[PDB]
């Protein structure tokens, strides 16, 4: 007769009436994003999203969330990447990320495209998701840097990558975290995130408040004393060190 909320460390949650065994299983379960507003509502089995329809959390009454479904028939499914498949729906954007960031030419010289804030946000705000194919450290470290522009370590066993041609938004836009440029003085960090479509991945989270249209940057965190890093970063590293 009551409702349970189960929060991940990143601030997302699953919410609904649990079954007889205390599992998040039913037709009225929701994943709620860290804004505590954007939600994916519908059929889940033991916390796995089978069919989540885009919704807005409008209020809570006695702990029970009340949603309004968005128009458009945007539905989402648990769809963890593999070593060879980045997504079943590469062009279907994440609806939380789409309100928060956009891609445009970087303000940094020769740095290509960058990721920018759509609206002003506070500190500790999840802005973007870093999904990609899941490959080994051995594959990555034994190939040339020119193939490793977008690799991000997830844990000791797994590196997430967005390989060509999925580095172009015309071919892949389900997530956008691989579009954040590097800065030794960043406004964002990488953090763990448990995503209802992508599974266990990393996200980009603000360090401090950020203005609308401010470029989001992260410290790429390459080992400076193995620098095991691409050339543009090695150059930049020296410049940085000098300004210190």
């Amino acid at each position: 007769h009551g409702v349970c909320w189960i929060y991940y460390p990143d601030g997302g949650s699953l919410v609904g009436e649990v079954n007889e065994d205390g599992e998040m299983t039913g037709e009225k379960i929701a994943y709620v994003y860290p804004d505590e507003r954007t939600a994916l509502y519908g059929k889940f089995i033991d916390g796995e999203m089978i069919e989540g329809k885009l919704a807005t959390l409008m209020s809570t009454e006695e702990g029970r969330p009340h949603f309004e479904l968005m128009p458009g028939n945007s539905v989402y499914h648990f769809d963890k990447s593999t070593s060879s498949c980045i997504s079943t729906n590469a062009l279907l954007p994440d609806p939380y990320e789409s309100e928060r960031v956009y891609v445009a030419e970087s303000l940094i010289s020769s740095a290509g495209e960058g990721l920018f804030s759509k609206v002003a946000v506070g500190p500790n705000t999840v802005m973007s998701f870093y999904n990609g194919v899941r490959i080994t450290h051995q594959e990555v470290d034994s190939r040339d840097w020119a193939l490793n522009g977008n690799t991000l370590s997830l844990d000791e066993e797994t590196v997430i990558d967005v390989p060509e041609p999925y580095n172009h938004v015309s071919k892949y836009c389900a997530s956008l975290g691989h579009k954040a440029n590097h800065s030794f003085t960043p406004n964002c960090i990488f953090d763990m995130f448990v995503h209802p479509r992508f599974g266990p991945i990393k996200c980009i989270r603000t360090l401090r408040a950020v203005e609308a249209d401010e470029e989001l940057t992260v410290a790429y965190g390459y080992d400076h004393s193995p620098p095991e890093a691409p050339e543009w970063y090695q150059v930049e590293l020296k410049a940085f060190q000098a300004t210190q």
Binding site: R143, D161, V218, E228
Partner: peptide
Amino acid sequence: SKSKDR
């Protein structure tokens, strides 16, 4: 390692 954030 040739990846971000290890």
